[PDB]
Nucleic acid binder design. Structure first.
Ligand code: FES
Ligand SMILES: [K+]
Ligand SMILES: [Mg+2]
Ligand SMILES: [Mg+2]
Ligand SMILES: [Mg+2]
Ligand SMILES: [Mg+2]
Ligand SMILES: [Mg+2]
Ligand SMILES: [Mg+2]
Ligand SMILES: [Mg+2]
Lengths: 137, 86, 49, 135, 97, 100
RNA sequence: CCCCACUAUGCUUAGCCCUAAACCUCAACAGUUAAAUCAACAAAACUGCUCGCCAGAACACUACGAGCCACAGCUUAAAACUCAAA
C-alpha cells in the first residue's frame, strides 16, 4: 500500500502497527519550544507521565537555555528516562517556534526513541488576548 | 481543546526520516499562513499598521504578478537572431 | 595619410546608395556578406587569424 | 534661413510663407510638385489624445449574415479535419460549402432555422461530405 | 446600396463566459461534504478564491456556509473531517512531500 | 462591373475562417534558424515553431506543414500602458507535414 | 529607548464631553473628451451651476467678548509691537 502522511483515524480499522501497538496506544512526547527555553515531557496514551526534561533542568542558564544544543541535550535526557520505562516509539507534539523546536526532536532520536509522527499544536488565537505592545529597537 | 487530537497539523514519519516529515509539516504550516501568523502575533500590530502592511502586500503581489506576466510575454522573442547581419 | 575621395559629384548626388548611413563602406560589406549567406541556403586556424 | 518648427503648421505652409517673406531665395525642388498634387490631408502635427468618459472609437465590428451560420456549424460539427489553405484565394472549407447550401435552401422559401439546418447536413452527406458531430 | 457591405449585429462567434464549479448550485451549511472540499486538510483554513477557483459570489456563500456549519455543530474548525479526505480534489494546492 | 473591396473582404478565406483559435491551417516554411522554423500560413504575421524531434530533417525551406492556430497576433496590454504590446508573430502549434 | 510588576483606562450600562493627518489633504449636482494636454508635483484636462471659504508672514488651535452638562475644556476669533520676506 502507498504511504499516507495522514494519521490513522481512531475507530477505523488500520493495518499499521508499531511493536504490536496501534497509533492510539503510542506514547506522546510533548515538546514546548519557547523563545528562551525548551520543555519536553513524555506521557503514555493514558496521560501517565513517564519523563520530563528541559534545558534548565540540564544545567543551562539564561541565554544558553535558548539554544538548539541545549534543547538537543534536554531531549537526550528525557529519552533516557523514558526508554527505561519501556518507550521506543513516540508521537511528537511540538508547540512553539523556539530554537529548540527541531533540535529537541533530534535528541529524542539520538536517545533511542523512534518518532512515528509529528504534530504541531502551537496556540493560535482566533481573534483571543491582546499581545504585549511592540518593542522600539 | 474540544476537538479530536492528532488530526490537525499532523504528519506521519516514513522510514524513520524525521527530517523530511518535519520539512513537510513546516511547508504545510507555511502555505496555510500559520508561521507568518504566529510571528506577527508575538507583539500587537495596531490596526492602522495592519491595514498599511496588508495594503502594501496586496499591491506588491499585484505588481509582481504583473511583472512576471510581462517577462513571460516578452521572452517569446528570446530566440536566436533570424536576420543576423541586418 | 590616405584621404577619402569626394562622395558626390557636381549635381550633389552621392555615388554610393548607402551614403546617408555615414558608414557606406562598412554597411556595403555587411550587405555583401549577408547576401552570400542567403544564396548558400538557396543552393543548399593555427596559421591564420 | 529656414524653419525647424515641425509642430507649427506643415512643411508646405512653412515653406510657402518663408518664400513670400523673402527668407528663402529659391523654392525647394518638391514645392512645385506638392502644389500641383497635394495630399488629401495637409501634414500638420497633432498630439494624439486619450478618450475619456463616453467617447468611443467609431470603428465598427465587421459581421455578415452568414457568420451566424458559421457559429452554429462550428458548435455543432466543430472545425473540419480538413485544413484551411489560406494561400488559395478560391479555397472553400466545409463550413463555406455548408453555408452556400444553407443559403440556397433559404432562397427556396424555407424560413425555419432549426429545420433549414438539419436539411442542409443531409444534402452534404448525400454529396459524400464527412460531417462528424462533436457531441 | 451594396450587398457586400458589413452588417451591424452582435458577435456570433462570442464564447460563453466562464463559470465556477459551483455556478448554479445551492450551497447549504448542512452539506459538509461540499464545504470540506474548500478547507485545508491539516489546518482547516478556508482557501482563498485564488486556490478554490470560485467566483466572488460562491466564495462568499461557501465562506458563510462554513462559518455557519462550524459553530452550529456540523463541521470541525481546526481540521478537515477525515471522512472527506478522499473526495474530489478541486483546489489548486499541492501539499505533501 | 469592378469588384469592390467590401466584396473581396466578405469572400476572403481569412474572413470565412472566423475565429482562429483551434483552426487547422496549412503553412509554408520560408526561413529556418537552427531548430526554429518560421512558417507563413496566410495571415498578417508568421509563427515560429521548434523543429519536431521526429522527422526533423524533413522540415526544410518550402516544406508545407499543418498548423493548429491559437492567435493571429500575440498582443497584450500591460499595467500602466496606453497601448498593447505586440511581439509581431502569431501563436500556432506545429502538428506535422502535409503530404499528397 | 530595553526588562518585570501593577493602576487609571480599553469592556458593559446610563449620562456627558464634541475633538483628529475626522485626509481620496479631490465641496455638492450636471455635462464634455474637442480644443491649448498641461506652471510643477499629486490624481489626465476642463465646462455649467450653487453653497461654504480665502486675501503676505508671524503674533495666533492666542487675548477679550459670547454660547455651551464642557470649569487646566470646546466653538467663534482679533489687535498692538515685529519683519521683507513667509
Ligand atoms: S460563476 Fe456563476 S455563480 Fe460562480
Ligand atoms: K490621508
Ligand atoms: Mg484594571
Ligand atoms: Mg479616518
Ligand atoms: Mg456642500
Ligand atoms: Mg497673515
Ligand atoms: Mg485643538
Ligand atoms: Mg481657546
Ligand atoms: Mg473667553
Amino acid at each position: 500500500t502507498k504511504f499516507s502522511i495522514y494519521p490513522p483515524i481512531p475507530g477505523e480499522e488500520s493495518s499499521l502497527r508499531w511493536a504490536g501497538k496501534k497509533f492510539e496506544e503510542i506514547p506522546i512526547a510533548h515538546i514546548k519550544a519557547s523563545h528562551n527555553n525548551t520543555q519536553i515531557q513524555v506521557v503514555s496514551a493514558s496521560n501517565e507521565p513517564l519523563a520530563f526534561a528541559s534545558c534548565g533542568t540540564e544545567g543551562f542558564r539564561n541565554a544558553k537555555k535558548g539554544t538548539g544544543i541545549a534543547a538537543q541535550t534536554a531531549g537526550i535526557a528525557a529519552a533516557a528516562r523514558a526508554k527505561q520505562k519501556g518507550v521506543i516509539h513516540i508521537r511528537v507534539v511540538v508547540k512553539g517556534l523556539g530554537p529548540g523546536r527541531l533540535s529537541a526532536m533530534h535528541g529524542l532520536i539520538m536517545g533511542g526513541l523512534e518518532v512515528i509522527s509529528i504534530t504541531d499544536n502551537t496556540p493560535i488565537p482566533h481573534x483571543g488576548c491582546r499581545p504585549r505592545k511592540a518593542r522600539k529597537l | 481543546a474540544k476537538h479530536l487530537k492528532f488530526i490537525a497539523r499532523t504528519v506521519m514519519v516514513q522510514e524513520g526520516n524525521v527530517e523530511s516529515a518535519y520539512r513537510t509539516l513546516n511547508r504545510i504550516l507555511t502555505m496555510d499562513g500559520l508561521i507568518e501568523d504566529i510571528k506577527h502575533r508575538r507583539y500587537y500590530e495596531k490596526p492602522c499598521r495592519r491595514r498599511q502592511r496588508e495594503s502594501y502586500e496586496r499591491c506588491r503581489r499585484i505588481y509582481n504578478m504583473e511583472m512576471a506576466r510581462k517577462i513571460n510575454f516578452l521572452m517569446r522573442k528570446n530566440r536566436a537572431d533570424p536576420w543576423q547581419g541586418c | 595619410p590616405r584621404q577619402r575621395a569626394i562622395q558626390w559629384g557636381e549635381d550633389g548626388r552621392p555615388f554610393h546608395y548607402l551614403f546617408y548611413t555615414g558608414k557606406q563602406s562598412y554597411y556595403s560589406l555587411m550587405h555583401d556578406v549577408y547576401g552570400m549567406l542567403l544564396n548558400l541556403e538557396k543552393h543548399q586556424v593555427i596559421g591564420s587569424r | 534661413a529656414g524653419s525647424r518648427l515641425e509642430t507649427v503648421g506643415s512643411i508646405f505652409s512653412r515653406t510657402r510663407d518663408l518664400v513670400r517673406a523673402g527668407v528663402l531665395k529659391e523654392k525647394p525642388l518638391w514645392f512645385d510638385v506638392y502644389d500641383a498634387f497635394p495630399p488629401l490631408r495637409e501634414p500638420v502635427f497633432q498630439r494624439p489624445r486619450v478618450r475619456y468618459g463616453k467617447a468611443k472609437a467609431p470603428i465598427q465590428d465587421i459581421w455578415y449574415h452568414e457568420d451566424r451560420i458559421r457559429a452554429k456549424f462550428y458548435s455543432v460539427y466543430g472545425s473540419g479535419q480538413r485544413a484551411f489553405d489560406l494561400f488559395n484565394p478560391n479555397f472553400k472549407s466545409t463550413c463555406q460549402r455548408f453555408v452556400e447550401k444553407y443559403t440556397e435552401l433559404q432562397k427556396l422559401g424555407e424560413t425555419d432555422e432549426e429545420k433549414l439546418f438539419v436539411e442542409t447536413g443531409k444534402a452534404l452527406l448525400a454529396e459524400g461530405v464527412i460531417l462528424r458531430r462533436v457531441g | 446600396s451594396n450587398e457586400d457591405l458589413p452588417i451591424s449585429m452582435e458577435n456570433p462567434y462570442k464564447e460563453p463566459l466562464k463559470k465556477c464549479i459551483l455556478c448554479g448550485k445551492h450551497v447549504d451549511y448542512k452539506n459538509v461534504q461540499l464545504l470540506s472540499q474548500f478547507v485545508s486538510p491539516f489546518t482547516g483554513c478556508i482557501y482563498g478564491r485564488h486556490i478554490t477557483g470560485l467566483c466572488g459570489k460562491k466564495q462568499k456563500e461557501i465562506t458563510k456556509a462554513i462559518k455557519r456549519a462550524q459553530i452550529m455543530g456540523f463541521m470541525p474548525v481546526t481540521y478537515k473531517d477525515p471522512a472527506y479526505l478522499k473526495d474530489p480534489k478541486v483546489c489548486n494546492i499541492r501539499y505533501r512531500e | 462591373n469592378v469588384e469592390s473591396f467590401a466584396s473581396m473582404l466578405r469572400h476572403s478565406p481569412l474572413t470565412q475562417m472566423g475565429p482562429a483559435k483551434d483552426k487547422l491551417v496549412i503553412g509554408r516554411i520560408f526561413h529556418i534558424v537552427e531548430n526554429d522554423l518560421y512558417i507563413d500560413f496566410g495571415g498578417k504575421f508568421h509563427c515560429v515553431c521548434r523543429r519536431p524531434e521526429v522527422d526533423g530533417e524533413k522540415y526544410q525551406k518550402g516544406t508545407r506543414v499543418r498548423l493548429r492556430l491559437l492567435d493571429l497576433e500575440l498582443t497584450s496590454r500591460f499595467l500602466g500602458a496606453t497601448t498593447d504590446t505586440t511581439v509581431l508573430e502569431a501563436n500556432a502549434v506545429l502538428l506535422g507535414i502535409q503530404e499528397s
